[PDB]
Design a protein around this motif. Structure first.
Motif, PDB file in Angstrom:
ATOM      1  N   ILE A 181      55.879  12.643  38.079  1.00 42.14           N
ATOM      2  CA  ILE A 181      56.117  12.992  36.678  1.00 42.14           C
ATOM      3  C   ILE A 181      57.463  13.670  36.575  1.00 42.14           C
ATOM      4  O   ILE A 181      58.232  13.329  35.690  1.00 42.14           O
ATOM      5  CB  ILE A 181      54.986  13.898  36.097  1.00 42.14           C
ATOM      6  N   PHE A 182      57.762  14.642  37.464  1.00 44.18           N
ATOM      7  CA  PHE A 182      59.023  15.366  37.355  1.00 44.18           C
ATOM      8  C   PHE A 182      60.148  14.392  37.613  1.00 44.18           C
ATOM      9  O   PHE A 182      60.982  14.204  36.742  1.00 44.18           O
ATOM     10  CB  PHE A 182      59.136  16.551  38.359  1.00 44.18           C
ATOM     11  N   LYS A 183      60.186  13.783  38.817  1.00 48.62           N
ATOM     12  CA  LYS A 183      61.355  13.004  39.217  1.00 48.62           C
ATOM     13  C   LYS A 183      61.629  11.909  38.211  1.00 48.62           C
ATOM     14  O   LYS A 183      62.760  11.788  37.766  1.00 48.62           O
ATOM     15  CB  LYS A 183      61.160  12.396  40.639  1.00 48.62           C
ATOM     16  N   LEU A 216      64.995  11.147  31.145  1.00 47.79           N
ATOM     17  CA  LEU A 216      65.396  11.943  29.986  1.00 47.79           C
ATOM     18  C   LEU A 216      66.743  12.583  30.219  1.00 47.79           C
ATOM     19  O   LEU A 216      67.561  12.543  29.314  1.00 47.79           O
ATOM     20  CB  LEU A 216      64.370  13.061  29.650  1.00 47.79           C
ATOM     21  N   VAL A 217      66.998  13.184  31.403  1.00 46.65           N
ATOM     22  CA  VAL A 217      68.274  13.869  31.613  1.00 46.65           C
ATOM     23  C   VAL A 217      69.421  12.960  31.243  1.00 46.65           C
ATOM     24  O   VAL A 217      70.384  13.444  30.675  1.00 46.65           O
ATOM     25  CB  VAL A 217      68.468  14.419  33.060  1.00 46.65           C
ATOM     26  N   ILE A 222      69.547  12.668  27.369  1.00 52.85           N
ATOM     27  CA  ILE A 222      69.885  13.928  26.708  1.00 52.85           C
ATOM     28  C   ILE A 222      71.261  14.360  27.162  1.00 52.85           C
ATOM     29  O   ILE A 222      72.147  14.497  26.333  1.00 52.85           O
ATOM     30  CB  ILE A 222      68.801  15.021  26.983  1.00 52.85           C
ATOM     31  N   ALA A 223      71.457  14.598  28.480  1.00 56.99           N
ATOM     32  CA  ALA A 223      72.732  15.138  28.946  1.00 56.99           C
ATOM     33  C   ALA A 223      73.877  14.215  28.609  1.00 56.99           C
ATOM     34  O   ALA A 223      74.939  14.733  28.306  1.00 56.99           O
ATOM     35  CB  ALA A 223      72.746  15.396  30.475  1.00 56.99           C
ATOM     36  N   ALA A 224      73.705  12.873  28.654  1.00 58.25           N
ATOM     37  CA  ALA A 224      74.825  11.974  28.366  1.00 58.25           C
ATOM     38  C   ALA A 224      75.656  12.463  27.203  1.00 58.25           C
ATOM     39  O   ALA A 224      76.872  12.449  27.303  1.00 58.25           O
ATOM     40  CB  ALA A 224      74.353  10.536  28.025  1.00 58.25           C
TER      41      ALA A 224
END
Length: 23
Positions: free
Chosen positions: A5-7, A13-14, A17-19
């Motif tokens: 779930i984390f990885k 999402l990162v 979102i971060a993009a």
């Protein structure tokens, strides 16, 4: 387990979102 779930979750999402900030 929480690792899948984390990885995978943060892995996808990162980018979406971060993009905007870390293009």
């Amino acid at each position: 387990g929480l690792k899948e779930i984390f990885k995978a979750g943060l892995g996808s999402l990162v980018k979406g979102i971060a993009a905007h900030v870390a293009s």
